[PDB]
Design a protein around this ligand. Structure first.
Ligand SMILES: O=C(CSc1ncc(C(=O)O)c(=O)[nH]1)c1ccccc1
Ligand SMILES: [Cl-]
Ligand SMILES: [Mn+2]
Ligand SMILES: [Mn+2]
Ligand SMILES: [Zn+2]
Length: 461
């Protein structure tokens, strides 16, 4: 009555045969799971990766978190935190003491139902000022992946068994059914797994993944992680609810790192007709989030999770829509979607054939859109043009000054404003000079582009 738990998300228990190929499995469950936004996956009894560490030698910099509903929090940035330092042992000791002191009970006898109830009480009661700490970063020499990775150091035969698993999250990016694989541009924050060390009540605010990608989260060990998820189709519903209750979160900001997010009771969303689902993720289980599926949660206690973004062929059209949406909001991109597409086209001979077919369809849309934009800017009197290798420019040197989109297919420059670019939607936002002073900078002619797409079609057969 104070808190009503959302209904449970789907839980899948695949056979080893069903489980072995993550991409085939995800495609199979997608008609069910995309209706709930998140789902949980229990691997077959078979699958049991080694979880081995000396907690005395693993160090990380803790982040501090206040727990107030609707209060703005800043998105985690790589290597922030500060200079302070915990080992996994001293953090665990701190975390277990916090929880057992908080409830005056041993940590495992606190029911998950109760921690959940207490979480939503304490975040709404700002007479309470509970602060907690957590770890969040990519693998480093001081704190590595919880999955086996190659290095020597001699690996056990059981560790070797899991090196090339499709569910070893170090691998998921670089597998052939993943389209982020082919991206040459390092984007560490996105293609590499994140490591999360949690404690009771430490939480992750409501968000969707960059570029509306999937995510997959594995809980290596510890107390459960509680999740709330919202299906992709209700993303704008949720955002509307949020913009009315917490308008502060929707101000334009300097960059991608200054992104603001918040804790919000799922009952509040359910009250405004946003469908929400929940789950408790236990050690050894996976949670999968689908494209544009909002999710949030908190930890039941001391634990260690690993998560990574990924993008399947199914995602490609949504990826294009996402960048369009980013343009409308003037939100920064993590990478150029078109650059990714053209990179794959340039590698058509070595592409998985299903990938080739789907890339070809997205490329066809890209080319027709580009054709139309170029005709529009020509009618605005932009006549001069020159080829430009956009992929060579640092990202922050090829952003539209208006909408911040990362340019690749083309942009407009002007001698009156050296170094500045606009995308072709924002030709009028660059300078006040006469039209003929403008230059179309383009990566490819239409005559370059159609053969590239043809190579994909041949590969797809
Ligand atoms: O703030 C975040 C990090 S997402 C995150 N997920 C899970 C945990 C966790 O299980 O402990 C966490 O600490 N953080 C974010 C990410 C993308 C866009 C905007 C914000
Ligand atoms: Cl509070
Ligand atoms: Mn996430
Ligand atoms: Mn505009
Ligand atoms: Zn623009």
């Amino acid at each position: 009555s104070m808190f009503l738990p959302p209904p449970e998300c789907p839980v899948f228990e695949p056979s080893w045969e069903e489980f072995a190929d993550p991409f085939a499995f995800i495609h199979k469950i997608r008609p069910i799971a995309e209706q709930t936004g998140i789902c949980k996956v229990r691997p077959p009894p078979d699958w049991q990766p080694p979880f081995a560490c000396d907690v005395d030698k693993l160090h990380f910099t803790p982040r501090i978190q206040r727990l107030n509903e609707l209060e703005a929090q800043t998105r985690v940035k790589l290597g922030g935190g500060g200079a302070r330092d915990y080992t996994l042992r001293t953090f665990g000791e701190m975390a277990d003491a916090f929880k057992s002191d908080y409830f005056n009970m041993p940590v495992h006898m606190v029911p998950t139902e109760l921690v959940e109830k207490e979480f939503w009480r304490l975040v709404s009661t700002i007479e309470e000022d509970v602060t907690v700490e957590y770890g969040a970063d990519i693998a480093s020499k001081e704190f590595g992946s919880g999955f086996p990775v190659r290095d020597g150091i001699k690996l056990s035969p059981e560790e070797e068994e899991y090196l090339d698993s499709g569910w070893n999250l170090n691998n998921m990016p670089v597998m052939e059914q993943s389209v982020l694989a082919h991206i040459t541009a390092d984007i560490c924050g996105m293609k590499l797994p994140w490591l999360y060390v949690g404690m009771c009540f430490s939480s992750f605010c409501w968000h969707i993944e960059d570029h509306w990608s999937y995510s997959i989260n594995y809980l290596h060990w510890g107390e459960p992680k509680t999740w709330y998820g919202v299906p992709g189709y209700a993303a704008e519903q949720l955002e509307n609810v949020m913009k009315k209750l917490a308008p502060e979160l929707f101000v334009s900001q300097p960059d991608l790192l200054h992104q603001l997010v918040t804790i919000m009771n799922p009952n509040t969303l359910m009250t405004h007709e946003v469908p929400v689902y929940r789950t408790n993720q236990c050690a050894g289980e996976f949670v999968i989030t689908f494209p544009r599926a909002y999710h949030s949660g908190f930890n039941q206690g001391f634990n260690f999770a690993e998560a990574v973004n990924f993008c399947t062929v199914d995602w490609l059209p949504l990826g294009r829509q996402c960048v369009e949406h980013y343009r409308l909001l003037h939100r920064y991109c993590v990478f150029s979607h078109d650059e990714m597409i053209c990179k794959m086209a340039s590698k058509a001979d070595v592409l998985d054939v299903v990938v080739a077919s789907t890339v070809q369809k997205d490329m066809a849309i890209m080319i027709e859109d580009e054709k139309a934009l170029r005709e529009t800017v020509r009618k605005l009197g932009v006549i001069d043009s020159e080829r430009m290798d956009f992929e060579l420019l640092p990202d922050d040197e090829r952003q539209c000054v208006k909408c911040k989109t990362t340019c690749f297919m083309s942009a407009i420059s002007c001698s009156c404003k050296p170094g500045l670019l606009v995308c072709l939607h924002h030709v009028k936002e660059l300078c006040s000079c006469p039209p003929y002073k403008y230059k179309l900078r383009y990566r490819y002619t239409l005559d370059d582009l159609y053969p590239m797409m043809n190579a994909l079609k041949l590969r797809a057969e």
